Design a protein around this ligand. Structure first.
Ligand SMILES: O=P(O)(O)O[C@H]1[C@H](OP(=O)(O)O)[C@@H](OP(=O)(O)O)[C@H](OP(=O)(O)O)[C@@H](OP(=O)(O)O)[C@H]1OP(=O)(O)O
Ligand SMILES: [Zn+2]
Ligand SMILES: [Zn+2]
Ligand SMILES: [Zn+2]
Ligand SMILES: [Zn+2]
Ligand SMILES: [Zn+2]
Ligand SMILES: [Zn+2]
Lengths: 330, 145, 91, 255, 41, 117, 193, 156, 83, 103, 264, 48
């Protein structure tokens, strides 16, 4: 080889040092009562108003959000047209005047509940997968993302688009978040096979949840007695954990029988505490007793029912929906 | 070993500590307005605390309605301690049990040393810079603070 | 003291409890078998109780070869129990 | 062909299963990587992973390095390294059997050293004395999650899955014993298919049971004993005589 | 009594010769008196 | 045939090796486990070398040359604490005077607790 | 790892090198787990080194200042007898402990002249020398001890342990040799063989 | 590097202008230190190769700045050597003919190789290529075990 | 000890008779070999345990060797079918 | 007693384990050796019987009833040439014993 | 201490081989006793590392290579070697291998060759064996499923059929030979054969492949002069076609046999 | 460990009072805690 040829050969290496490569490549529910005409292409999120459930909030495909009354007319009060992609999550702030919305457009928007006005809008570098807000403060919210970060925001803050803090101890996409009902601590789950509890506005997790056989947990919720919380693991079983400062799992509180895997199926609780519910990919609306994890029933409601929610005062009443679009009420 | 675990069988050490803590808390409740106390809180202390002999925490934590005038540290039966030095709104009571021996049964020296040691660590053991440590010697049946 | 009251010490029992909580481990031979089968809901744990009945009838049948009458009585009773376990997991 | 594409990464490094096995005792032994203080509960479990030969096969570093041996974890359907693997990511074929033909007497196609005696279990790598081409297929009830299935249906399942993994001489299913026997053309394909199908399910995505396939114990794939059938024995004697006569040609022509 | 027996033959040292040492360092086999004396002649 | 001196590695390399051998559950660590048990006979030597090089009261942070096995099994301090005897005597005499003065002046000398952790 | 290879997972080793059983042990467990003086000497030397290292760690965290560090090192080296328990497995270390006590006496009564009582004496160099010179002669002993132990772990135990004639075996071996002597004489003189 | 202490003298002028680059090298090494808990032996070796690369690269930064760009005073270079931001003895190799792009010192430690040879990464790539061609194969050498170097002959 | 021997033979005959019953029922269970007390323990049926063949003398033994082989295999078939 | 070949194998395992244990614990009981060899002749396994007689001779080659038993055992099963080799060996090792010559 | 016994086919063709000796480095695969391990590579840049698996005294006892356990004269495995010799000798010889570990240790130390080894360990005997070898080479629901089987119909040009029925399959035939001969005819295929049934079914990927198959010569297919007969099977088949149990398959085989004997 | 060991290892989370309460709940289900007799070694008190 000539020196010029050796010079050209050096330039072909994929890297500017010795490590550059030469490689080639370059109570009990019984029966359905009514159904609302939800999103024709499919409902992806549902929520009752938090303290009193007189209204049902809905979001799904067709890039739209809608709100329905639960009494006297059973009709949509108003729509919200400001999204370009399907709704991922919806969350009423703890003072009912506003709700948070996230979509696959990488945009998180907070809407005025009664007027339908965008209080503020956030544009993100990654797809948000959950939105949540403090029980003690309606102005404070949190956003989990696909890039394993958790962004923290207070809408009164203008600096850095209101980003008050960021959390980092997660090796993959965040899948769900939940505040404690006191709102001083919050919980988050990830694509990485672990869950963490965090002090609010502190970048250190106070506890880690891991086991040699733990599956990922795409949804998480709190039992109304608030001594315990719960999550829907991809093992086709739901699990429950203590909110007490030991934060350990409780052994016999396993909830099996439902086809969950590959879908973001929701889980919900009766307002009296004593009963719990989940969807299914083949439309069996499952229910269980919370006191002993005993099975209750399933209803073959008219397809994956990804969303379920239970009224804070209407005993034995529950709503569900999914890709079928229609929003069924028992 | 057999004789002393026979005496302290069925967790008697922790029982003694809990009962004395409750007794001091329950009599501080009866003087709450007298001493201008906003609240008396029995603390949820770690179970090994009663026999954690190299470290400590507050057993009772106590709030002020309006701030107290407190002395520099002094023994329970010293008389001339003057309150003008220092001011605080939070205080704690720490109950320490010991089992003495012939070399060491001066409980007053024990509480003084343990107080001045624990209150002057780089990392603070207690929820306030001011408080009282109470000591009980079980072998010799003595008390001081 | 003997092996039995060492194994039934508080520390060993607590470690058993922690192991059945933390990893699902349970040596079923330690524990009294349910008299009524229908109160058992998992197919896994019902089959494990069935295995306990199986090893019990094996050990009894090793001693069958008053003696024959009483052990035959207990043997067929345990076969009745085994039938009930098989029935339960089959329904 | 597998030669037309670079090998797929089967499982990501973060998706690999934990090394600590399921708990069967009170304390984890850091030396033995096993549980001590009691022994209760079964150690068998269904594999989370399965090979998909047309999808996962492809070229690797091993093809460029002149490698002989196949990837153990490719067969298990859980290779982390994909195209950066030193070992071959494809089903063994007559070319590679020919390349292995020297080492094959004492080594597995995975390059593992053979033993003198089989395990009492008849599991494991196999014997350098026997040159066995036949796999016993047990645990078929657990591989179907105890689903009731007709015998010819079971045979059709076994026929499908094992025929992806090599050229086959015979498959037979025995209803009374509830077990199958698969014989390959080459011992290398029997070696490969054993590790590929060990602890797997026979269930389909079409089955109603598919969403709980992980719960039981999978297929129990072992070396077969000698067939006691007299027809098979005289067939074995005939092929032994034929192999002997073919070898006489080589000895005579060399000397 | 049959556990309690006399010695009919002693164990042969030929058995110990049949396999190799296993590397245990005994204290009495450490070096010592490492030089031989010799007589005047 | 030919000799060259032992290469000195980055300290982060050793630090990483000690970090990775935390749990050792994988099959890749069998040979490392055996090396760990074989290292056990050389621990009193390593303990002597460590304590021999202990920092004296007048120095904050003593950097020491070390020899370590690439399995992470054991780390020896590979140096001798050579000192100039009249200087060492003067250093310890200054330390002696300072400690005397501090015991005099410090109103309350708070001793450590043992074990510290 | 040595504990776990021997299967003694029912014993736990603290991070301050105390060995404690996790449960009340069976007699077979007690016999099987009866670790010897080699392990224990190794463990207690690690414990001593751990104490020293932990004081330096406390200094470097800023929790105690330099004078407290000096006094702490001096206290450890003087109070090995109370902190470490190493005498239980090698009682000849009492010479080191006694030497440290004597050194403490002479050091204190040079140091505390016109100062009075209380902690603060950090002149730890003599006791430090005592323990280093102990480690000098402890290295070959523990190397032999631990080597034989680990050799037993990997290679196993020798098949052909020849018991010596100690005074517990003296009478039995006398009987065996006398019996063989009588038998040799009588079987030689008998005509019929 | 060596931790700042009363033992150490303050940095000469110009250390502030190079500090951002050194701090990012520090950041990368702090990340690389940690127990990522790799399961495989191969990927565990790759993580040590990362550290060796970072060590090389920071030493190359200081080396090029002082010896080639001449943007650095002798005092500042001596300070960086003394506080061990840079590998003294590897820089000493880069000054020699035929070693201008050496990866690390272990790869030329002949007295510990099985055959008494250097590491294979010091062979020029053309020589390995023509040996492989004469044998009739591709080149089997990708990365050497010591540091992951893919070839550091000065021609390459 | 004789009581223990009685109990051991009782358990052996238990296994034997159970195996015979199951053989009459057409489910052919194999007899369980004894458990090895130590890892190197011997099964004396698998090998002639320490075979010391007779040293070959001047006389040819071949004809009576094949006769003995005939006798042994005849006995084996006989015990298989007649018991 | 024994109805099946597998049952014969069980019986033979038990008896062989018994005899081998006793001859391990005390090899010098020549009568025990002789009756173990007799057991294997009863099993018609002449290879095992020959091996046991050979091992017994290795324990003690001077004991004349053991030689006579082995020779007679070979002759009883019509193995005349084996017996011829054996007797020639017998006189070759013990030429001064009249009984072997007469046999 | 004897030298290693390694064959030329293990060592390769390079002029020089570096080899690493390790005393007591390995435990022998045959006898479990420790031995001096040798290991080498055929060239410096070959990526597979070859090692002695058996000790030298086990290897000389068997007359085999320590690295591949083929016969060190004839380069064939022990079973085939002892079988070959036992065709030339009337009185059989075979390598009797110990099963108990103490017998494995015991057997390895006696210095006597085993099986066919002595007959191959000197040139005179081995040459005599091959000279003699040259002389050797010089010298019940059947009544239902028989309407599911296509036996009433024939091999034809016009009907497009993707599936076929195979019968008169000799049990000697492996499945792969059938697939291979169809592959030869098509110039390249799901096959079921039940050998207890002596029949089977063949299913093609698409109709043009089946049409190309029927384009080449009820029909017949040849496997080493076994005349497999073939019929187009328009009704799709599965494994159930040949019977649900072993007895049904055997009964079907006898039925097909008498049908073949009528057809011939 | 020796016969006369002073200390046993307790896990860091071990509360003795909760442990005893849990072990009491467990004791009602263990076989050998509920069998009707205790095995003992004794001498025959009289000729029988
Ligand atoms: O038993 P000793 O070796 O003699 O040492 C005893 C103490 O050690 P410990 O028993 O371990 O506590 C020691 O304190 P420490 O070394 O712990 O700091 C005291 O020194 P100082 O008060 O600080 O000056 C001694 O007082 P003097 O008598 O003035 O030397 C005391 O002696 P005593 O037992 O006769 O009273
Ligand atoms: Zn791979
Ligand atoms: Zn390099
Ligand atoms: Zn390098
Ligand atoms: Zn290199
Ligand atoms: Zn061998
Ligand atoms: Zn070879």
């Amino acid at each position: 080889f000539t020196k010029s040829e050796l010079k050209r050969r050096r330039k072909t290496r994929k890297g500017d040092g010795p490590w550059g490569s030469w490689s080639s490549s370059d109570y009990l529910p019984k029966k359905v009562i009514r159904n609302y005409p939800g999103h024709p292409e499919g409902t992806t999120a549902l929520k009752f108003l938090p303290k009193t459930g007189h209204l049902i909030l809905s979001g799904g495909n067709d890039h739209t959000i809608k709100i329905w009354d639960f009494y006297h007319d059973y009709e949509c009060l108003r729509d919200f047209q400001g999204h370009n992609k399907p709704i991922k999550a919806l969350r009423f702030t703890e003072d009912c005047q506003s709700f948070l919305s996230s979509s696959f457009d990488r945009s998180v928007k907070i809407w005025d509940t009664e007027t339908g006005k965008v209080k503020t809008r956030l544009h993100l570098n990654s797809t948000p997968a959950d939105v949540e807000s403090r029980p003690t403060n309606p102005h404070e919210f949190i956003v989990g993302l696909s890039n394993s970060k958790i962004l923290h925001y207070d809408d009164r803050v203008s600096e850095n688009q209101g980003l008050v803090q960021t959390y980092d101890h997660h090796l993959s996409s965040i899948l769900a978040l939940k505040y404690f009902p006191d709102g001083s601590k919050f919980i988050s789950s990830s694509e990485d096979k672990t869950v963490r509890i965090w002090e609010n506005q502190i970048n250190v997790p106070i506890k880690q949840i891991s086991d040699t056989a733990q599956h990922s947990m795409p949804f998480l919720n709190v039992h109304p007695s608030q001594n315990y919380f719960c999550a829907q693991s991809m093992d086709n079983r739901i699990y429950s954990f203590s909110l007490k400062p030991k934060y350990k799992r409780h052994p016999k509180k396993i909830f099996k029988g439902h086809s969950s895997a590959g879908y973001g199926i929701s889980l919900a609780f009766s307002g009296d505490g004593r009963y719990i519910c989940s969807g299914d990919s083949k439309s069996r609306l499952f229910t269980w007793d919370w006191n002993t994890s005993r099975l209750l029933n399933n209803i073959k409601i008219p397809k994956p029912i990804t969303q379920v929610d239970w009224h804070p005062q209407e005993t034995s009443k529950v709503i569900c929906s999914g890709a079928a679009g229609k929003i069924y009420v028992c | 070993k057999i004789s002393l675990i026979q005496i302290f069988r069925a967790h008697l050490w922790q029982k003694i500590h809990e009962s004395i803590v409750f007794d001091i808390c329950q009599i501080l409740d009866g003087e709450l307005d007298v001493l201008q106390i906003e609240s008396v809180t029995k603390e949820t202390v770690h179970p090994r605390k009663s026999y954690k002999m190299n470290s400590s925490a507050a057993d009772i934590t106590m709030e002020s309605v309006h701030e107290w005038e407190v002395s520099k540290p002094s023994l329970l039966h010293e008389t001339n301690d003057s309150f003008k030095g220092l001011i605080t709104n939070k205080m704690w009571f720490d109950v320490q049990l010991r089992y003495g021996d012939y070399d060491s049964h001066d409980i007053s020296r024990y509480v003084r040393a343990k107080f001045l040691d624990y209150t002057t660590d780089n990392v603070s053991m207690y929820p306030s810079p001011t408080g009282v440590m109470i000591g009980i010697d079980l072998a010799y049946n003595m008390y001081d603070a | 003291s003997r092996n039995v009251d060492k194994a039934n010490s508080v520390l060993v029992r607590f470690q058993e409890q922690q192991a059945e909580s933390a990893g699902g481990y349970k040596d079923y031979s330690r524990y009294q078998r349910p008299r009524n089968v229908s109160k058992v809901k998992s197919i896994k744990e019902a089959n494990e109780w069935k295995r306990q009945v199986s090893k019990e009838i094996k050990q009894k049948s090793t001693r069958i070869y008053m003696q024959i009458a009483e052990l035959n009585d207990e043997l067929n009773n345990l076969f009745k129990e085994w039938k009930r376990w098989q029935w339960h997991i089959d329904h | 062909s597998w030669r037309d594409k670079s090998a797929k990464v089967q499982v990501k490094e973060s998706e690999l299963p934990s090394s600590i096995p399921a708990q069967t005792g009170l304390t984890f032994n850091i030396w033995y990587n096993k549980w001590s203080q009691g022994f209760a509960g079964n150690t068998r479990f269904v594999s989370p992973f399965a090979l998909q030969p047309q999808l996962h096969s492809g070229k690797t570093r091993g093809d460029n390095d002149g490698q002989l041996f196949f990837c153990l974890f490719f067969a298990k359907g859980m290779c982390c390294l994909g195209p950066k693997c030193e070992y071959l990511h494809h089903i063994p074929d007559e070319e590679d059997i020919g390349k292995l033909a020297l080492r094959t007497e004492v080594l597995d196609c995975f390059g593992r050293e053979k033993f003198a005696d089989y395990r009492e279990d008849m599991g494991g790598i196999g014997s350098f004395r026997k040159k066995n081409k036949t796999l016993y297929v047990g645990g078929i009830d657990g591989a179907l999650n105890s689903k009731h299935l007709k015998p010819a249906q079971i045979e059709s399942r076994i026929r499908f899955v094992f025929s992806r993994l090599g050229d086959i001489d015979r498959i037979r299913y025995v209803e009374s014993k509830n077990c199958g026997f698969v014989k390959f053309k080459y011992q290398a394909n029997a070696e490969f298919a054993k590790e590929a199908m060990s602890n797997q399910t026979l269930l389909l995505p079409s089955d109603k049971e598919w969403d709980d396939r992980r719960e039981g114990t999978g297929l129990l794939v072992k070396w077969a004993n000698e067939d006691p059938d007299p027809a098979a024995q005289k067939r074995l004697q005939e092929e032994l005589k034929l192999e002997s006569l073919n070898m006489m040609v080589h000895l005579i022509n060399n000397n | 009594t049959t556990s309690h027996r006399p010695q009919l033959e002693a164990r042969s040292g030929a058995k110990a010769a049949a396999y190799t040492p296993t590397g245990i360092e005994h204290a009495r086999l450490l070096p010592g008196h490492t030089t031989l004396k010799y007589r005047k002649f | 045939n030919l000799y060259t001196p032992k290469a000195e590695m980055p300290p982060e390399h050793l630090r990483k090796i000690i970090n990775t051998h935390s749990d050792m559950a994988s099959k890749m660590y069998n040979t490392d486990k055996k090396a760990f048990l074989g290292a056990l006979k050389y621990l009193p030597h390593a303990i002597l070398k460590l304590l021999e090089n202990m920092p004296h009261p007048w120095e904050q942070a003593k950097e020491v040359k070390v020899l370590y096995h690439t399995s992470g099994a054991i780390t020896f301090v590979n140096e001798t604490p050579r000192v100039i005897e009249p200087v060492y005597t003067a250093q310890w005499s200054a330390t002696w005077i300072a400690m005397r003065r501090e015991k005099r002046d410090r109103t309350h000398f708070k001793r450590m607790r043992f074990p510290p952790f | 790892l040595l504990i776990h290879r021997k299967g003694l997972t029912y014993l736990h080793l603290d991070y301050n090198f105390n060995l404690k059983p996790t449960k009340t042990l069976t007699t077979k467990e007690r016999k099987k787990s009866r670790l010897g003086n080699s392990f224990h000497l190794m463990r207690e030397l690690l414990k001593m080194m751990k104490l020293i290292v932990d004081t330096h760690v406390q200094f470097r965290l800023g929790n105690v200042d330099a004078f407290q560090l000096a006094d702490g090192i001096h206290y450890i080296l003087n109070h090995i007898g109370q902190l470490t328990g190493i005498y239980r497995y090698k009682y000849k270390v009492m010479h080191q402990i006694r030497a440290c006590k004597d050194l403490k006496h002479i050091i204190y009564y040079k140091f505390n002249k016109n100062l009075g009582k209380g902690p603060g004496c950090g002149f730890w160099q003599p006791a430090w020398r005592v323990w280093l010179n102990f480690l000098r002669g402890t290295i070959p002993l523990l190397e032999r001890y631990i080597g034989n132990l680990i050799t037993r772990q990997f290679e196993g135990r020798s098949n052909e342990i020849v018991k010596t004639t100690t005074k517990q075996r003296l009478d039995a071996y006398y009987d065996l040799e006398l019996r063989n002597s009588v038998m040799d004489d009588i079987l030689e003189m008998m005509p019929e063989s | 590097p060596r931790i700042k202490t009363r033992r150490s003298k303050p940095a000469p002028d110009g250390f502030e202008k190079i500090k951002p680059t050194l701090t990012d090298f520090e950041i990368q090494l702090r990340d690389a230190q940690k127990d990522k808990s790799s399961k495989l032996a191969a990927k565990s070796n790759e993580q040590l190769w990362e550290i060796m690369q970072l060590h090389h690269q920071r030493s190359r930064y200081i080396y090029t700045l002082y010896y080639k760009r001449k943007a650095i005073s002798k005092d500042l270079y001596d300070w960086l050597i003394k506080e061990k931001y840079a590998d003294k003895l590897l820089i000493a190799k880069w000054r020699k003919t035929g070693y201008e792009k050496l990866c690390c010192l272990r790869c030329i430690q002949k007295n510990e190789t099985n055959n008494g040879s250097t590491c294979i990464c010091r062979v020029p790539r053309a020589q390995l290529e023509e040996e492989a061609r004469k044998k009739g194969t591709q080149v089997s050498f990708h990365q050497c075990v010591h540091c992951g170097c893919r070839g550091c002959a000065s021609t390459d | 000890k004789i009581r223990e021997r009685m109990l051991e033979e009782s358990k052996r005959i238990a296994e034997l008779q159970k195996r015979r019953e199951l053989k009459q029922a057409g489910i052919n269970v194999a007899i369980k070999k004894p458990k090895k007390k130590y890892g190197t323990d011997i099964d004396y049926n698998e090998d002639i345990v320490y075979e010391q063949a007779p040293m070959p003398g001047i006389y040819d033994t071949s004809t009576e060797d094949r006769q003995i082989k005939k006798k042994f295999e005849q006995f084996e078939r006989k015990v298989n079918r007649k018991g | 007693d024994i109805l099946d070949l597998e049952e014969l194998r069980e019986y033979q395992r038990r008896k062989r384990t018994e005899y081998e244990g006793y001859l391990k614990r005390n090899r010098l009981d020549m009568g025990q050796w002789i009756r173990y060899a007799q057991f294997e002749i009863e099993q018609h396994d002449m290879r095992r019987a020959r091996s046991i007689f050979e091992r017994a001779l290795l324990v003690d080659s001077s004991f004349i009833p053991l030689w006579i038993r082995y020779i007679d055992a070979e002759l009883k099963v019509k193995c005349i040439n084996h017996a011829r080799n054996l007797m020639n060996r017998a006189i070759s090792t013990l030429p001064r014993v009249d009984k072997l010559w007469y046999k | 201490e004897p030298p290693p016994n390694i064959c030329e086919q293990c060592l390769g063709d390079e002029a020089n081989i570096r080899m690493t000796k390790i005393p007591q480095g390995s435990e022998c695969k045959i006898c479990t006793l420790p031995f001096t391990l040798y290991h080498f590579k055929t060239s410096k840049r070959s990526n597979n590392i070859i090692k002695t698996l058996i000790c030298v005294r086990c290897a000389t006892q068997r007359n085999i290579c320590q690295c591949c356990m083929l016969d060190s004269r004839w380069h064939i495995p022990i079973q085939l070697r002892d079988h070959l010799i036992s065709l030339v000798n009337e009185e059989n010889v075979m390598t009797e291998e110990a099963k108990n570990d103490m017998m494995k240790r015991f057997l390895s130390l006696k210095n006597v060759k085993l099986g066919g080894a002595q007959i191959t360990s000197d040139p005179s005997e081995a040459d005599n064996i091959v000279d003699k070898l040259k002389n050797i080479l010089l010298r019940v629901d059947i009544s239902h499923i028989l309407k599911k089987l296509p036996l009433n119909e024939s091999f034809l040009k016009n009907p497009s059929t993707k599936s076929f029925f195979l019968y008169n399959i000799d049990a000697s035939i492996p499945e792969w030979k059938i697939t291979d001969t169809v592959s030869q005819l098509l110039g390249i295929l799901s096959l079921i054969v039940n050998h207890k049934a002596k029949c089977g079914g063949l299913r093609f990927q698409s109709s043009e492949l089946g049409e190309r198959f029927v384009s080449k010569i009820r029909g017949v297919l040849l496997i080493d002069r076994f005349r497999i007969f073939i019929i187009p099977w328009s009704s799709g088949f599965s494994a159930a076609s040949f019977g649900t149990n072993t007895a049904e398959n055997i009964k079907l085989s006898l039925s097909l046999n008498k049908l073949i004997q009528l057809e011939l | 460990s020796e016969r006369k060991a002073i200390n046993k290892y307790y896990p860091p989370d071990y509360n003795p009072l909760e442990a005893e309460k849990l072990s009491r709940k467990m004791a009602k289900k263990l076989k050998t805690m509920n069998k009707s007799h205790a095995s003992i070694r004794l001498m025959t008190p009289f000729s029988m």
